[PDB]
Amino acid sequence: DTIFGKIIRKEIPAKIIFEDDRCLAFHDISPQAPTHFLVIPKKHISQISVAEDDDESLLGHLMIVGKKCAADLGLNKGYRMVVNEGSDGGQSVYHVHLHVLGGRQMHWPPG
Amino acid sequence: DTIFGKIIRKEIPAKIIFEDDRCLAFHDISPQAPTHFLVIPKKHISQISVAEDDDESLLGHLMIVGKKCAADLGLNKGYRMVVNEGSDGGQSVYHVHLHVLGGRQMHWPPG
């Protein structure tokens, strides 16, 4: 369940930007940029390393939802899409979630 | 097009990791981590903000391939996946590309 499950279950409140039969995009509570949100699959996939080849269209779906919400958020100057795998990736929640950061200049390297 | 085009075209060398009929994975020339390689679409989508809703499985396919290469490359302790959009996003080349970074701990915020 994590907090993700409870949020999707609307058990607990989130700054929901978007929703459809496949995902939930809500604002990241500990933003690392002016605008920071997460686009996550309602379906549980702990980490990208274990995403199946049939999981393919959902991953790209998270990606498209991300690009739509970001434009919705007026992110016309740009943004950075992120997914963190495991320990070195700094994966906090073991449920696949796509980070979207904007509102400012991102730097190289990406952490 | 871009250098990514000529790379796809075999015009200029590249440290190729995997190829199939729709995409190419190869090492980043200026790596930002022990393992830093990219996954790019043969179809020239200039950037994610423009990607057709038809590019959804393709954009998912990138991520799929990516995590596969990360696994073939032995990245079993995690890594980070990145998609830079526009100036704020710090998009170096205007042709959709997915970063995969590992070999070391990735920090938060992600740039």
Curated annotation (Swiss-Prot), chains A, B:
AMP binds at D28, I29, N84, G90, Q91, S92, H97, L98, H99. It is found in: Cytoplasm; Nucleus. Changing H36A: No effect on affinity for 3-indolepropionic acyl-adenylate but a 13.8-fold increased affinity for tryptamine adenosine phosphoramidate monoester. It comes from the Eukaryota. GO terms for biological process: intrinsic apoptotic signaling pathway by p53 class mediator; positive regulation of calcium-mediated signaling; protein desumoylation; proteolysis; purine ribonucleotide catabolic process; regulation of DNA-templated transcription; signal transduction. Changing I29W: Approximately 30-fold increased affinity for tryptamine adenosine phosphoramidate. Changing H95A: No significant effect on affinity for 3-indolepropionic acyl-adenylate and tryptamine adenosine phosphoramidate monoester. The keyword Transcription regulation applies. Keywords: Acetylation, Apoptosis, Cytoplasm, Disease variant, Hydrolase, Neuropathy, Nucleotide-binding, Nucleus, Phosphoprotein, Protease, Thiol protease, Transcription, Transcription regulation, Ubl conjugation pathway. Changing H36R: In NMAN; no mutant protein is detected due to post-translational degradation; no effect on SUMO-specific isopeptidase activity. Residues 3-111 form the HIT domain. Widely expressed. The modification Phosphoserine is found at S30, S57. This is Adenosine 5'-monophosphoramidase HINT1. The gene is HINT1.
